[PDB]
Each structure stands twice: as C-alpha cells, then as structure tokens.
C-alpha cells in the first residue's frame, strides 16, 4: 500500500505493456501463421429449435459433454467426458441413476426409412459403456450396453438384457430379457446368470458414487482450485520422524480425502 | 520452408520472453489470474504453415478438432467431437458433406508402412457417427455407415454404401450401387433407388440442420453464466 505500492503498480503496468509488445513482435516474426488460442466457445447445455434440455439438479454433466436440444435427464444420472446427446430433430429421455460413459454418442431421427420413427428412450439404472452409439432406439430399465456397442434405429434392449462390447445391433432387433447378445451383426450368445444381473445393478450404483466426486471436482472455482493445488503439494510427501521430534501429527485435510464408497475396499 | 521455420522458432523465443515479462508485471501488481487452467483447445490448429482452410458457409462445431492442412467446402458440416488431422498428408472435404458427431478423419501418422495416403471426401457425402476414415477416398454421393472403419487405400465409388459398423480392409474398392458390411466388409446386396434418394435428401437435410446449429453456436456468450462462474463459492 501507499506511495511505494502505487509506484510498483505503475512499473508493473509498464512491464506488462512491454511484454505484450514483445509478444506482438514475436507473432509478426512467425509470419502470423499461429492461430491464436481463444476463450472457450463450447456450451455444455445448448438450445436448438427453441428446445431446452431438462436436467435434474443432481446430475453430473461433464463440462466437455454436449447436451443439445430436447433432452431430459433424470435424478442421479451422469453424462461423462466427451459425450454428445443431440436432441435436435426428436426427443432424448434418460431415466434415473443411469450412466452414459465417456465419448458416447446419442442421437435421434426425424423420419426413419420405414415404420414409426421413435425417440431415444434410455431407462432407469442403465449402464451405457464408453464410446457407444445409441441411435433412435429404446433401452429399458436395468439393461447393460457394452463399451463400443452400436444400437441402430428401432432397436429395443429389454429389462435385464445385455449387449456385449463391440456389438453391432441391426435395425429393429429386439434383445429379450435375460440374454446377452454380441458380434457384428449382434446375435444371441447366452443367458445372463443371476450374478451378472447383480453386476449390472452394482455397475449402476458404483457410477452413481463416481459421478459425485467428478461433479464436485469439475465445479470448483479458480480460488478453490489454487487452494487445493497448494494443499496437495504440501501433503504429497511426509517426514513423520521430524514430526515426532516436534511432537505434532499432520492430518490430511478433508478436501483431499475421497468418500469411502469410491475407494477400492 | 526452412527459413520460415527458423523465423517461426525465433518468433517463439520472442513471444516466450514477452509473455514472461507480462507475468512479471502481473506479479508485481499481485495478480495470479495467469495461473488459471483454461482450455488450450483450438477448433482450427496449424502445424507451422499447414493450416485449415474452411469455407465461410461450413459449420464446424467448436469442440471439433481440425489440425493441419484440411479443406472444407461450402455447405459442409463438421459435427460435435469430430477430429480431422491432416499433417503428414492432406485431407479434403467437398461441398455439402456432413461429418457426423465423434467421427475421425485422419491420415497415417508415419510413412513407415509406405507413402502416406491423403483422405479425399467428395461432395454430398454422409459420414455416420463415430466412423473412422484413415487415408481413403470417398467419392460423391456415397454413404458411410456410422461406426464403420475405412483403412488406407480404400476407394468408395459414387453411390457406394458402407454399412454401419463395417470394417473395410486396406486397398478394398467398393463398387458403385453396392452395400458392403461386416468385419471384414463384403458385398451384401445392391443399392435400391429409394436409398439413393435418401442419400441425397439426408445430405440436404444435414446442410439445413448445420445452418440451424451454426446460428445457435454463433450467438453471443451469455454474461450471466460468466458472472455465475466468477462469483461461485
């Protein structure tokens, strides 16, 4: 503060002007070839055709996800990094406690080649694996869709049914309850054991828990990010022997401790 | 050329120095805002002089990655999450062509497996969601099913169709009017005339949908959201 503070601030202004001038000169020397980085224009939630996505309070939507148009997402659901939910020509509905994994595409159609064109309906407690493609089809509650699987228009995945990782499910195919289908084209592989039904449920609840920590981290402000960076650096290593000499016990701050429901045990 | 790269390199030295000077000036004023972790994603990215040339009438989603020498024609559209990387060779997209969400159009990263082929996409082409195109040619008015993979040297002739989830092996030629699918991709049947009509009309519909999404994205960034993010506690 005071006169010294003001003088140092003015000198900082001069230094900033000089630095930005040097940056401009360096840009000129590069032949202006470098496209400049800019403020991020990606919108996590966007309207189109006067349709606004309806997203429940406690839904993790990763900032890099794209939720566009007429999309409804229910309680406890999670949309992960790089997901695209494009509800522009038709409706997309996601039930409660359903996870849409990273880099997944969900889309709809305005008019199919033949039959009744239907919206994309994803039920409750559904797991959809990484990089899946869901197009104009219906996934009923407690179903599992493997990573990298493709569901074409009119496909119905029934309750407690599984689509294996990597499968290509042709248009209008029906996956009956209790069966697992896979391959390209997808076809019946075998019945689902009871332990696998329990797995599907477990998948869904584990995701519900994972979504909480990811949502908490992605929503932190600049100041909290800096505070936690400093705290993480301070507690990354230890000298418990010198602490015992000092007669103190350093405790990990609670903002660095994860909840027990996401820990391996 | 070599002189251009030398000046580009020297330019980086000057720029690095100027930005460091600016950070010093901010530090003297007690500002730490340069420490903020802000995304360095660029929708269009140059690799030295190899830069994307995009037509003014083409929609490119902000989250898409266009890297190096990539040409996009009028009325064409690059959708959300798409990646187009032409650095070792070029990638060209014709007019009225849609590249759907999460698709990947790239060339061989190295010439170890031989000369790196370019990727040529003709006019009024549909490239389905999450398709992979790797150093191939896709002629006008063809259909690439979503989730399909086309390897280098492949040629998809006009009105050809690649079924969803197909794996077209290296150097395979897809003849006109034919539907190929499966892993490996094989002849399935002939294309019907209704399918040709749907190819054209779906492409024209995508160009209109592109227009709508480009207008949506071009709207000014909301300042209320900015203030909400700034004033969080």
């Amino acid at each position: 503060m005071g006169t010294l503070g003001r003088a140092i601030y003015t000198v900082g202004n001069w230094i900033r002007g000089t630095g930005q001038a040097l940056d401009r000169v360096g840009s000129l020397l590069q032949g202006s070839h470098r496209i400049e980085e800019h403020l991020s224009r990606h919108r996590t939630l966007m309207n189109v055709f006067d349709k606004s996505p309806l997203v429940d309070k406690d839904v993790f939507v990763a900032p890099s996800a794209s939720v566009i148009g007429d999309v409804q997402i229910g309680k406890g659901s999670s949309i992960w990094y790089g997901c695209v939910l494009r509800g522009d020509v038709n409706n997309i509905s996601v039930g409660s406690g359903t996870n849409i994994q990273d880099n997944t595409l969900v889309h709809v159609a305005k008019t199919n080649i033949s039959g009744k064109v239907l919206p994309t309906l994803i039920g409750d407690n559904v797991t959809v694996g990484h990089s899946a493609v869901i197009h104009g089809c219906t996934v009923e509650d407690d179903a599992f869709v493997g990573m990298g699987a493709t569901l074409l228009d009119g496909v119905v995945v029934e309750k407690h049914a599984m689509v294996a990782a990597g499968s290509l499910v042709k248009q209008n195919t029906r996956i009956p309850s209790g069966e697992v289908w896979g391959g390209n084209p997808a076809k019946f592989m075998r019945k689902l054991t009871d332990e696998e039904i329990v797995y599907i449920s477990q998948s869904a609840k584990n995701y519900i828990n994972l979504a909480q920590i990811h949502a908490s981290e992605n929503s932190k402000s600049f100041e909290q990010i800096e505070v936690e960076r400093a705290l993480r650096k301070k507690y990354a290593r230890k000298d418990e022997d010198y602490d015992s000499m000092l007669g103190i016990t350093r405790e990990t701050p609670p903002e660095l401790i994860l909840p027990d429901n996401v820990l391996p045990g | 050329g070599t002189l251009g790269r030398a000046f580009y390199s020297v330019g980086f030295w000057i720029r690095e120095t100027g930005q460091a000077l600016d950070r010093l000036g901010c530090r003297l004023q007690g500002k730490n805002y340069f420490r903020e972790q802000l995304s360095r994603h660029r929708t269009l990215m140059n690799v030295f002089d190899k830069a994307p040339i995009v037509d003014k009438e083409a929609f490119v989603a902000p989250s898409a990655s266009v890297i190096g020498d990539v040409h996009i024609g009028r009325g064409s559209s690059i959708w959300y999450g798409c990646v187009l990387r032409g650095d070792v060779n070029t990638v060209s997209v014709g007019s009225g062509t849609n590249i759907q969400d999460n698709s990947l159009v790239h060339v061989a990263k190295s010439n170890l497996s031989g000369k790196v082929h370019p990727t040529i996409i003709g006019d009024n082409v549909t490239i389905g969601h999450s398709a992979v195109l790797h150093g191939c040619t896709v002629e006008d008015e063809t259909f690439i099913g979503m989730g399909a993979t086309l390897l280098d040297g492949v040629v998809v002739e006009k009105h050809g169709m690649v079924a969803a989830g197909a794996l077209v092996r290296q150097n395979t030629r897809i003849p006109s009017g034919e539907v190929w699918g499966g892993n490996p991709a094989r002849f399935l049947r002939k294309l019907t005339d209704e399918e040709i009509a749907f190819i054209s009309q779906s492409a024209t519909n995508y160009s209109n949908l592109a227009q709508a999404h480009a207008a949506e994205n071009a709207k000014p960034l909301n300042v209320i959201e900015f203030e909400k993010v700034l004033r969080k506690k």
């Binding site: 503060m1 010294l4 503070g5 003001r6 601030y9 | 007690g30």
Partner: peptide, 29 residues
C-alpha cells in the same frame, strides 16, 4: 491501482537496490 502486499514491495525494493548497486559497483571499480 496499488500493490498491497507490503513484504512483496519491500522485496521488490531490495532486488532493485541489489541490481542498481551492482551496476554502480562495476562502474566505480
């Protein structure tokens, strides 16, 4: 308008004094 961290300002003065005094030390020797 003003830098408020007093200790930082004092350190800035100390660095400036070191630089200028070093220049004078070289010049007058």
């Amino acid at each position: 308008k003003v830098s408020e961290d007093k200790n930082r300002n004092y350190a800035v003065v100390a660095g400036v004094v070191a630089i200028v005094g070093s220049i004078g030390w070289y010049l007058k020797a």
